[PDB]
Design a protein around this ligand. Structure first.
Ligand code: HEM
Length: 82
């Protein structure tokens, strides 16, 4: 099975209490990763609640960073918003 979230719902998780964001078609919960992010939490807060795919790709994340991102996946973006 798979759980789908709508863009509408994701936009409400944009704070230190709950930080979600979209990368491609997956939804990530980075709440417990904020203060652990080598890139700092400020950059993440700004992208919270939306599609950060471009920003994520542009900054040049390492292969190590990519594999680690997977541990934060909680579902997928509903096809209606893809
Ligand atoms: C899925 C969650 C993410 C993980 C697991 C993650 C992980 C990391 C790691 C391990 C680094 C260290 C350098 C490297 O290995 O590439 C890093 C650097 C960085 N990340 Fe992320 N990152 C995530 C999301 C993001 C997002 C969405 C943004 C941008 C909106 C971002 C912006 C940055 C920046 C600017 C740096 C610093 C690069 C530098 O100082 O040269 N990261 N990230």
């Amino acid at each position: 099975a798979v759980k789908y979230y709508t863009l509408e719902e994701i936009q409400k998780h944009n704070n230190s209490k709950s930080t979600w964001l979209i990368l491609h078609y997956k939804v990530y919960d980075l709440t417990k990763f904020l203060e652990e992010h080598p890139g700092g939490e400020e950059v993440l807060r700004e992208q919270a609640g939306g599609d950060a795919t471009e920003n994520w790709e542009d900054v040049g994340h390492s292969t190590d960073a990519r594999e680690l991102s997977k541990t934060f996946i909680i579902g997928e973006l509903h096809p209606d918003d893809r």
